Design a protein around this ligand. Structure first.
Ligand SMILES: CCS(=O)(=O)c1ccc(CC(=O)Nc2cc(-c3cccnc3OCc3ccccc3)cs2)cc1
Ligand code: NA
Lengths: 252, 10
């Protein structure tokens, strides 16, 4: 079926590095240089107050839509990732249901400016105060701190490519039918990320990477806050939340 | 529904 479902040689692991990095460049949504250049474009006091005065449901709908836009690029990344399409449809759905949000949160660090603690949202950079109308402050500050700790690692685009590939191909996700096939794909992607870090003298970041439970805590926080919003405005979720967002975070 | 469709659309 696929070469990376078996034990790969050094040269094949080298091909995998290049393959993962190509897949990511083609699906990274926004180019890094565009995000970096736009760092000077920050929302004014007036604009921040405008977002803060928006109704809770209005802000929830905008954030869910933007998050769905990013997730779509992650689905495209998985489709182009070596071996993912060779897995069964059950296992592809399992991996994306559990990992799409985690990949988006990793990818988000590119759009985060550590210097002034701002994130890129709807054309400009804004601090966490911009999201106050959502009424989920703990979760917003948890995403900002996570973006901050990743930003401190000074990830290259190639590093994000290889790390996110590994975030997606997790053989420990509950519900995987072909666990051994996934285990082997993960082991080769692991070798590819660690080979690239070795080749770029970047192995010092391995101990500095966040624990797996941290990304899981952020996804659990997001699902818990959505359920709270759902009880308050159920028809907002039912009529105006994107169908892909509902399929991943509420259950269809 | 949506995820199955995205994965099938080549
Ligand atoms: C990822 C690929 S990228 O190219 O780096 C890239 C492409 C496009 C954008 C623009 C964009 O969509 N900005 C967004 C920022 C946030 C967000 C940030 C911090 C904290 N909370 C957030 O809202 C959480 C939330 C809350 C409730 C529901 C859903 C979601 C959500 S959406 C950025 C980066
Ligand atoms: Na950053």
């Amino acid at each position: 079926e696929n070469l990376y479902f078996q034990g790969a040689s050094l040269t094949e692991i080298e091909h995998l590095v290049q393959s993962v990095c190509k897949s990511y460049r083609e699906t990274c949504q926004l180019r890094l240089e565009d995000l970096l250049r736009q760092r000077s474009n920050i929302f004014s006091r007036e604009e921040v107050t405008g977002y803060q005065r928006k109704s809770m449901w209005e802000m929830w709908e905008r954030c869910a839509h933007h998050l769905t836009e990013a997730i779509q690029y992650v689905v495209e990344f998985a489709k182009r990732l070596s071996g993912f399409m060779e897995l069964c449809q059950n296992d592809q759905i399992v991996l994306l249901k559990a990992g799409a949000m985690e990949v988006v949160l990793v990818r988000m660090c590119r759009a985060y400016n550590a210097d002034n603690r701002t994130v890129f949202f709807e054309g400009k950079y804004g601090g966490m105060e911009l999201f106050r109308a959502l009424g989920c402050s703990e979760l917003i500050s948890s995403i900002f701190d996570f973006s901050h700790s990743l930003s401190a690692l000074h990830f290259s685009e190639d590093e994000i490519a290889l790390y996110t590939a590994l975030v997606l191909i997790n053989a420990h996700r509950p519900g995987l039918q072909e666990k051994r096939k996934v285990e082997q794909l993960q082991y080769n992607l692991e070798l590819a990320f660690h080979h690239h870090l070795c080749k770029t003298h970047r192995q010092s970041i391995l101990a500095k990477l966040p624990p797996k439970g941290k990304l899981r805590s952020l996804c659990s926080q997001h699902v818990e806050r959505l359920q709270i919003f759902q009880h308050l405005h159920p028809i907002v979720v039912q009529a105006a939340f994107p169908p892909l967002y509902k399929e991943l975070f509420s259950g269809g | 529904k949506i995820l199955h469709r995205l994965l099938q659309d080549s």
